[PDB]
Amino acid sequence: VTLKESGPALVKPTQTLTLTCTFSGFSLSTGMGVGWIRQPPGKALEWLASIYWDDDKYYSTSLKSRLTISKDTSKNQVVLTMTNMDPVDTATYYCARVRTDRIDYWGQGVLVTVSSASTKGPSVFPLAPRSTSESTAALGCLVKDYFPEPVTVSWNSGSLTSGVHTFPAVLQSSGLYSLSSVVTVPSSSLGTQTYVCNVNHKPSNTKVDKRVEI
Amino acid sequence: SVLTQPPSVSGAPGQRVTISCTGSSSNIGGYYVSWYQQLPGTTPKLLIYQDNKRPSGVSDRFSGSKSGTSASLTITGLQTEDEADYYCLSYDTSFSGWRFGGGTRLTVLGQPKASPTVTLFPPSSEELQANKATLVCLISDFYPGVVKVAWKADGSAVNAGVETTTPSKQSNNKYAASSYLSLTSDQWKSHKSYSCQVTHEGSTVEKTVAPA
């Protein structure tokens, strides 16, 4: 049972957003259905629409002419269409399974930002250790001036996970985000081992593997 | 046309706590209610469905209560791992589908103070080559989740170029934050010392870096 959303990270105002949820672990049979719920960052969940075995379509009255939902048990997908996108629609969009009714399992959700601003890839700078060496050293990467969210950071291709902490991004008045990811390692380990951050900004189709030397 | 939830509640460790969704004849009265929990940074999880029923694997510290235009979720043996946002859900005969409650943020009151760890990075050699300088002050593992961040240049208060994030709940119920001092390369070289001053619960932790 794995649900998966996919869509554009950035949508311009008044344009159309189209999500598609590819599913696993069932099929629109029985009395089962798949739903769409959104959540603005740090805010409450809002049920949007859902479709059942009947292809019975239910929509939110708050979103009158904007919502169409459709299924395709063939390629096992479920597609929702929202017209006339507004910045108030910026949210994480979840596709969930519904089984009188109840929401059983939730997907990871896709982040969608409705903005008139342009995509911008980040500049990645190393956060080098003097911190006149203590028993541990903090090293990291500064993911600077990007838009929109999100950004993912791993260390050493995911093989280094112990001392990792990626911090939530800051939003400057420029409209550009910046975040820092740092790993705390034993200062004994700064020559034994190389350290590279794997930054991925999918909205700009940019991946950067930056090593942090010294 | 109503679905009211208290935005914040709190209970004592090891005790009981109630989260209530109030409505009318169109929502909870006459239609089933579901409950969902959302831990920080993760997807919601089904708590209670069919008003009273819990699926498998769910803790039996949780339960739902029906009575007219009011639905309630109860949590016995409250523990710190229960701090999360809790939502109710029910259909309404006034609109076409499901309504979510506003959500209730649950706080557990027995947690001890943790003082923040402060890590201050000077600007990189790469960024100075681009004539810019971003000082990075990372604030981790503090409770409760309120800090004041001030910056100093040669001991004197900095009045511009500072941006600090809101505190964010992390894995272990503690909080994290970061603050950035954005300068040019010349401003960075104009002083001998820069300090990140983190005031948590009245005490201050200052870390200093130098261009030299």
Numbering used by the authors:
A (entry chain H): 2 to 34, 35A, 35B, 36 to 82, 82A, 82B, 82C, 83 to 96, ...
B (entry chain L): 2 to 7, 9 to 27, 27A, 27B, 28 to 95, 95A, 95B, 96 to 106, ...
Give the exact sentences the study uses for this entry.
The somatic mutations required for DH501 glycan binding activity are unknown, but appear to be important since its inferred germline precursor, the unmutated common ancestor of DH501 (DH501 UCA), lacked glycan reactivity and Env binding.
The structure had one Fab in the asymmetric unit (AU) compared to two Fab/AU for the somatically-mutated DH501 Fab in both its unliganded and liganded structures. In a superposition, the DH501 UCA Fv regions had a RMSD of 0.70 Å compared to affinity-matured DH501. The HCDR3 was disordered in the DH501 UCA structure. This difference in crystal formation may explain the difficulty in resolving the DH501 UCA HCDR3. The analogous residues in the DH501 UCA, D56HCDR2 and Y58HFWR3, were appropriately positioned to create the rudimentary glycan-binding pocket. In total, the initial VHDJH recombination event formed an initial cavity whose shape near the HCDR2 and HFWR3 was optimized by somatic mutation.
